[PDB]
Design a protein around this ligand. Sequence first.
Ligand SMILES: [Ca+2]
Ligand SMILES: [Ca+2]
Length: 110
Amino acid sequence: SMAFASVLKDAEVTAALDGCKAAGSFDHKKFFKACGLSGKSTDEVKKAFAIIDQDKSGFIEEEELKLFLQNFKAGARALSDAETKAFLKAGDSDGDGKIGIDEFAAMIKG
Ligand SMILES: [Ca+2]
Ligand SMILES: [Ca+2]
């Protein structure tokens, strides 16, 4: 659902949601950089990591990664098998199958 709408501008993330609408065209970097998440404070990020976390499993398993579009909405599709892979290695620096916060704030911090 529109959670980030609180943190960021629902209208802002919107364009960030339509920017990925394109299959195999999802550019997380562009996304975070769009809403501004990229460069933001590592504090808020942790708060942005919840928006996504729908099961508060503590982490964002590879299965949750593809659910990086269900954070800004409760319906948005899920990154492809590759898209999720890119967004994985793009963040996960250990390639274990999950992306923690320290890692989630990394893909954005860098
Ligand atoms: Ca989670
Ligand atoms: Ca990890």
